[PDB]
Design a protein around this ligand. Structure first.
Ligand SMILES: CC(=O)O[C@H]1C(=O)[C@@]2(C)[C@H]([C@H](OC(=O)c3ccccc3)[C@]3(O)C[C@H](OC(=O)[C@H](O)[C@@H](NC(=O)c4ccccc4)c4ccccc4)C(C)=C1C3(C)C)[C@]1(OC(C)=O)CO[C@@H]1C[C@@H]2O
Ligand SMILES: Nc1nc2c(ncn2[C@@H]2O[C@H](COP(=O)(O)OP(=O)(O)OP(=O)(O)O)[C@@H](O)[C@H]2O)c(=O)[nH]1
Ligand SMILES: Nc1ncnc2c1ncn2[C@@H]1O[C@H](COP(=O)(O)OP(=O)(O)NP(=O)(O)O)[C@@H](O)[C@H]1O
Ligand SMILES: Nc1nc2c(ncn2[C@@H]2O[C@H](COP(=O)(O)OP(=O)(O)O)[C@@H](O)[C@H]2O)c(=O)[nH]1
Ligand SMILES: [Mg+2]
Ligand SMILES: [Mg+2]
Lengths: 429, 367, 440
């Protein structure tokens, strides 16, 4: 009765989503053919959230994979968990976006989006009571950005009273991976700010720092980075699937976290993370999780909270716990580090505790934070944007596909105006 | 340009059939020009001051403020400034059944600010229609419905799904505007009347508990007045050009979802109206705090109404507002909220200037 | 499936074609007789990846390529050589004379009577493609066929096809070394015509590879069978994303965007860092950090142009093999900390990354070693103006006396087509100057 439609766009989302379903299945006990080989009953009590049912007691995911290059869709089908997807939900084309936002939005994505949405209406109208949507895409490219934000804009008009919980990888500060990350990110934020309800910002630079500093991993691959994001995508939606003393759906987070409708860009986290040796020297308890979660080195956003203020944060705990330990520790943070919290919000924290942990952990905890630090992900793009736009650096690849300079300017002012809304609360009062 | 404040006015409408049937006590009183409110709790009597107060409650008392009076007190000065070249804005505010779709447009027998302003403008122009200054008028008439824009002067096609929506876009200099708006040329008051009639026939209205014909869509009536002045110059003449914009706004009402009992589409549009008005209140409070020297950001972008009226609430225009209130006890809370927003709108100022439109040609530089 | 067409023109391209297809056939597992026993033992597959090899019913795999010339004496080493049973016998080779180092002879005179036959066999290969990615043209400035015919062909393709990426891999004329006294004329007329049609023309200079083969591989007496295997590795490192699985795969359209800011400055340079002999293949770590910095080392540039006399506008890196991304971001950070590498202020990102999992192979009989990692750096630098000017000055010296002009007019060419072309060459040198100037 609380269902989630999962869309994947581009190379980053699909290689995450393939790892996301390789995590949820291991939780609910589904195997790479869709069959059930679990131990407990709770794994199936609420399997209807992500997975549907099928004939021979199999379970098919509500997964809609989108792309414009078949090369990656095939990489998913040949993987371990590629066989459970619905082949009629592998929607793709040819003539890839070329890391051009316009191609994914206007020219090649326009000729494919109607085939994507007709699949969504099937999966959606087969739901008893829909909660919201869920997208995994990467800003900086064309497919995830143009064809991604397009579907968002079309889905809100068709399903406006539901949540569009977008998971989105933002560009990095130091080392780019596409030269025109700034052009594409400014335009996507112009769309996300107006057509989403909660957007989790992830930066790959901080994922590497998590893996190299804390986990003490030497050779981390992309299959390891996405092993962290999947863990966060799963904690936001645990108190739907499993029971607990104090539950919280997606909507409950958006209320307590978004005080003004534009400031829905969040800084996530996950606890506890340790090396393959150091776990013998720690002890798991609510305090040891709370410390990691409010530590700047644990955030996935590459943006230090201590250069800003927390407006309102969330902590979705999982495991047998005392609520006093939870309520008291979230209080101690506020009274100790009050300068990094807002004065005109009395309590800046909510809670949610599930009673069913992760496959092999006595307890776990997820962090979600709305912070005035998040300017820094936006001033960089804007300054990168104006230095390139002021001389029309790579622009004829965007004008020649049905755009004008007016649209690049709008996307700058909306990004700059989102910056100022965060600035006016950064300073004391 | 120089600082100029927003002219705030108030109007107390008379009892309606509903307040008479469910007999309620008069609570709003005018202490000469102040507007006082005597709460049934009788803890205190509030008193609010305004630049102007209108008492159209009675039909006998000295102080009766009729439609021509409201015009000659509020709208004619804006016509003076428009002829001076300034942009002007006027917008209504209030709760459901307060008389916002009456003060501005009026009935066929008691016309409002819109027809009086258009007629007076055209007549003054005809009077001043000398060979020196050639005048041109264009108009538009659009609305806002569930956060979507619609053009009222565009006849719907042969279908029901004909409310073809437009979108807003930011020109980097002229500010926000509507893409695809069928601006129409204006010769005279008769053509203005015809266009306006077609528009109001197309506008979204409906019946409810607290009104038989209530507006479920915000309405903006825009005039663009261009004066091309002749002058003796040694070269080509007719460079002196003044373009001024007049923007008249009829907003929708608060509407609690209990009195005006509704379900479905009525409720949905009732929610959207409510959200737009919330954002408007936030904008007004933010501009008031700007007037006191603090650092504030104005949430223009949180709604299409404020987005398309950005340059008028603050910005560059001689702005005014007309608050509308009922005199009964059942609407005391909405009356007080409206009056508070009205009085804290008075502290707003905006930098209005003459729109010479000669920057970097010769004349603004010579200035 | 995604596909690319490989057009080969003139002696300089054909001899590179033999080197590229020797490599493609080895990597996927094809014998010279078109067969792939791997699918006979496995039971079928797309290992004979359809980007470059089309398949028939008898198991034969034919390459998607066309091998144009005007000499018979070059192709007839193919029709009689090891790979005769691989290529379609339609090789489109003219039973007439050559162009004799003449643009006018290859462009119009003996470029017609051939072009229509070349443009059809290209049409046949394109109608067999379910989504075409682009072209790959192999020619050399200096000749008539690599200058003329390539300027004739790229004009026709911009008409019929238009939107497909049309890339060039060109042998830039060297400053000191040269095999013709009329290379500059044939080179400056070419850029006048291709500059409006091609989208990215990678350039190589034979002189730099001669030096690269001396310092690193220790080959004092090289031939053209050594330069071209090293060019074949550049093309493979580009086209690997279309053939093999990887983490970040860079298609053709992405080179065309990241590296080409303005339409007229699409003249980047290529290189390949781990040029290491078998002996020096040991004693080396060959990490991402060691391989990546070498791509910026001027000695290992494949064009004789000091990048330190200019600025980088864009740079695309194509890693291969056991390459982890964290090692790459450490490298690209280390390069932006230096000061001998000065970027433009309007490209604060500057970089692009591509990573594949299929390591490079070793063509037997060769010189390169079995390395587990490899890099191909494609850079857009403002330094290449110094090479354009050096060629223009050679052009203005011998054109003032109208030397060697009557051989061009005698084939159909107006005197003003030099001057017009010269003006075009004198513009581009200002564009590379303007864009490299720091903004206010
Ligand atoms: C019993 C034990 O000691 O093994 C642990 C373990 O030692 C540690 C190192 C694990 C381990 O961490 C990693 O190996 C890792 C590598 C790259 C990126 C992220 C993690 C572990 O691999 C990770 C793995 O995590 C889980 O099992 C959770 O169920 C996790 N799901 C999966 O790992 C999973 C992924 C794909 C397929 C099947 C299962 C999960 C996370 C969120 C929500 C639900 C489930 C677990 C328990 C462990 C190992 C195996 C060592 C930790 O990992 C996580 C994210 O929980 C690191 O800290 C936790 C717990 C332990 O410290
Ligand atoms: N790198 C490389 N360059 C070659 C090779 N063969 C010829 N060239 C170059 O070709 C240039 C001379 O022009 P050609 O390529 O022979 O002219 P063409 O395109 O063959 O046209 P024609 O000479 O009329 O047949 C010189 O710069 C040579 O370096 C080769 O095998 N490898
Ligand atoms: N001064 C007045 N004298 C008499 N009747 C009045 C007066 N002002 C308003 N009314 C009555 O008010 C009724 C509705 O007014 P209306 O113009 O719809 O207010 P409103 O603000 O537009 N309601 P809404 O559409 O929700 O905004 C009409 O039927 C008029 O008879
Ligand atoms: N975390 C993560 N990021 C990825 C992965 N693959 C690609 N990316 C990111 O995607 C961005 C490039 O966008 P891309 O996915 O190519 O867009 P597309 O080509 O339109 O699909 C880069 O910033 C990469 O860091 C992955 O497996 N994991
Ligand atoms: Mg009304
Ligand atoms: Mg020859």
């Amino acid at each position: 009765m609380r269902e989630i439609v999962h869309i994947q766009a581009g190379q980053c989302g699909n290689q995450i989503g393939a790892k996301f379903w390789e995590v949820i299945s291991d939780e609910h006990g589904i195997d790479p053919t869709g069959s059930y080989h679990g131990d407990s009953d709770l794994q199936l009590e609420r399997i209807n959230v992500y997975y549907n049912e099928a004939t021979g007691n199999k379970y098919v995911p509500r997964a809609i994979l989108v792309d414009l290059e078949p090369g990656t869709m095939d990489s998913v089908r040949s993987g371990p968990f590629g066989q459970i997807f619905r082949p009629d939900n592998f929607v793709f084309g040819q003539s890839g976006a070329g890391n051009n936002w316009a191609k994914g939005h206007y020219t090649e994505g326009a000729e494919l989006v109607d085939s994507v949405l007709d699949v969504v209406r099937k999966e959606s109208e087969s739901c008893d009571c829909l909660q919201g949507f869920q997208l995994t895409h990467s800003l900086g490219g064309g497919t995830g950005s143009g064809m991604g934000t397009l579907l968002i804009s079309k889905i809100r008009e068709e399903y406006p009273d539901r949540i569009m919980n977008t998971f989105s990888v933002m560009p990095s500060p130091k080392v780019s991976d596409t030269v025109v990350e700034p052009y594409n990110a400014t335009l996507s934020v112009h769309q996300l700010v107006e057509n989403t309800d909660e957007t989790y910002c992830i930066d790959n630079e901080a994922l590497y720092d998590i893996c190299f500093r804390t986990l003490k991993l030497t050779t981390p691959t992309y299959g390891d980075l996405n092993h962290l994001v999947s863990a966060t995508m799963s904690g936001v939606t645990t108190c739907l699937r499993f029971p607990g003393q104090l539950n919280a759906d997606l909507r409950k987070l958006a209320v307590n976290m978004v005080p003004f409708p534009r400031l829905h860009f969040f800084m996530p986290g996950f606890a506890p993370l340790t090396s393959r040796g150091s776990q013998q020297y720690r002890a798991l308890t609510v305090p040891e999780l709370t410390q990691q979660m409010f530590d700047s080195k644990n955030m996935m956003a590459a943006c230090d909270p201590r250069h800003g203020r927390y407006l309102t944060v969330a902590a979705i705990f999982r495991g047998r716990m005392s609520m006093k330990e939870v309520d008291e520790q979230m209080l101690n943070v506020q009274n100790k580090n009050s300068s990094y919290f807002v004065e005109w919000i009395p309590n800046n924290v909510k809670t949610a505790v599930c009673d069913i942990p992760p496959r092999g952990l006595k307890m776990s905890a997820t962090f979600i934070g709305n912070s005035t630090a998040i300017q820094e992900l936006f001033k960089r793009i804007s300054e990168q944007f104006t230095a390139m736009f002021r001389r029309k650096a790579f622009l004829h690849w965007y004008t020649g596909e049905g755009m004008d300079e007016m649209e690049f300017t709008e996307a700058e002012s909306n990004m700059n105006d989102l910056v100022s809304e965060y600035q006016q609360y950064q300073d004391a009062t | 340009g120089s600082n100029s404040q927003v002219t705030v006015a108030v109007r107390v409408r008379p009892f309606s059939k509903r307040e008479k049937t469910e007999k309620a006590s008069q609570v709003v009183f005018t202490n000469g020009e102040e507007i006082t409110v005597e709460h049934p709790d009788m803890k205190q009597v509030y008193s609010f001051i305004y630049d102007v107060s209108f008492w159209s409650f009675d039909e006998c008392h000295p102080g009766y403020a009729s439609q021509t009076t409201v015009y000659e007190t509020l709208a004619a000065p804006l016509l003076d400034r428009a002829f001076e070249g300034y942009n002007t804005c006027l917008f209504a505010y209030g709760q459901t059944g307060s008389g916002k779709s009456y003060t501005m447009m009026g009935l066929n027998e008691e016309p409002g600010i819109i027809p009086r302003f258009c007629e007076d403008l055209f007549a003054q122009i005809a009077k001043k229609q000398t060979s020196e200054v050639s005048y041109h008028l264009e108009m538009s008439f659009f609305e806002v419905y569930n956060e979507k824009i619609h053009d009222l002067l565009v006849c719907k096609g042969e279908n029901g799904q004909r409310k073809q929506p437009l979108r807003a876009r930011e020109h980097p200099v002229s500010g926000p505007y509507v893409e695809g708006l069928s601006m129409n040329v204006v010769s005279s008051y008769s053509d203005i009347q015809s266009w306006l009639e077609l528009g109001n026939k197309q506008r979204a209205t409906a019946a409810t508990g607290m009104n038989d014909k209530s507006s479920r869509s915000h309405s903006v009536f825009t005039l663009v007045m261009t004066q091309t002045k002749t002058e003796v110059v040694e070269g080509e003449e007719h460079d002196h050009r003044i373009t001024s914009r007049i923007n008249l706004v009829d907003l929708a009402g608060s509407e609690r979802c209990s009195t005006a009992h509704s379900s479905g589409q009525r409720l949905k549009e009732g929610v959207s109206i409510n959200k737009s008005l919330l954002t408007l209140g936030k904008v007004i409070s933010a501009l008031s705090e700007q007037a006191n020297g603090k650092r504030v950001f104005i949430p223009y972008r949180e709604s299409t109404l404020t987005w398309l009226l950005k340059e008028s609430l603050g910005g560059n225009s001689k702005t005014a507002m007309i608050a509308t209130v009922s005199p009964a006890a059942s609407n005391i809370e909405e009356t007080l909220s409206t009056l508070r927003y009205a009085t804290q709108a008075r502290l707003i100022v905006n930098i209005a200037k003459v729109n010479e439109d000669m920057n970097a040609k010769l004349i603004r530089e010579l200035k | 499936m995604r596909e690319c067409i490989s057009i080969h023109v003139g002696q300089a391209g054909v001899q590179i074609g033999n080197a590229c297809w020797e490599l493609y056939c080895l990597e996927h597992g094809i014998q010279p007789d078109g067969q792939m026993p791997s699918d006979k033992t496995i039971g079928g597959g797309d290992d004979s990846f359809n980007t470059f090899f089309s398949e028939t019913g008898a198991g034969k795999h034919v390459p998607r390529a066309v091998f144009v010339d005007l000499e018979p004496t070059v192709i007839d080493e193919v029709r009689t050589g090891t790979y005769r049973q691989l290529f379609h016998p339609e090789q489109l080779i003219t039973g007439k004379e050559d162009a004799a180092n003449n643009y006018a002879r290859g462009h119009y005179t003996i470029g017609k009577e051939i072009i229509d036959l070349v443009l059809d066999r290209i049409r046949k290969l394109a109608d067999q493609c379910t989504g075409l990615q682009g072209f790959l043209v192999f020619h050399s400035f200096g000749g008539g066929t690599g200058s003329g015919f390539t300027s004739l062909l790229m004009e026709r393709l911009s008409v019929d096809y238009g939107k497909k990426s049309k890339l060039e891999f060109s042998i830039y004329p060297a400053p000191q070394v040269s095999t013709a006294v009329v290379e500059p004329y044939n080179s400056i007329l070419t850029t006048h015509t291709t500059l409006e049609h091609s989208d990215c023309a990678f350039m190589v200079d034979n002189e730099a590879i001669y030096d690269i083969c001396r310092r690193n591989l220790d080959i004092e007496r090289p031939t053209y069978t050594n330069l071209n295997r090293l060019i074949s590795q550049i093309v493979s490192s580009i086209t690997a994303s279309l053939r093999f699985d990887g983490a970040l795969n860079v298609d053709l359209t992405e080179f065309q965007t990241n590296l080409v800011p303005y339409p007229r400055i699409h003249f980047p340079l290529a290189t390949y860092a781990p040029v290491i002999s078998a002996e020096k293949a040991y004693h080396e770590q060959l990490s991402v950090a060691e391989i990546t910095n070498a791509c910026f080392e001027p000695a290992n540039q494949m064009v004789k142009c000091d990048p330190r006399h200019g600025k980088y506008m864009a740079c695309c890196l194509l890693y291969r093999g056991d390459v982890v991304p964290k090692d790459v971001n450490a490298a690209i950070a280390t390069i932006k900390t230096k000061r001998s590498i000065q970027f433009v202020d309007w490209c604060p990102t500057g970089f692009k990354v591509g990573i594949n999992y299929q390591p490079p192979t070793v063509v037997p009989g060769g010189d390169l070693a079995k390395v587990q990692r490899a890099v191909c750096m494609l850079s857009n630098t403002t330094a290449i103006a110094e090479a354009w000017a050096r060629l223009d000055h050679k052009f203005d010296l011998m054109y003032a006396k109208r030397a060697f002009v009557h051989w061009y007019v005698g084939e159909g060419m107006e005197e003003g087509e030099f001057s017009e072309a010269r003006e075009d060459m004198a513009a581009l040198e200002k564009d590379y100057e303007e864009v490299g100037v720091d903004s206010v």
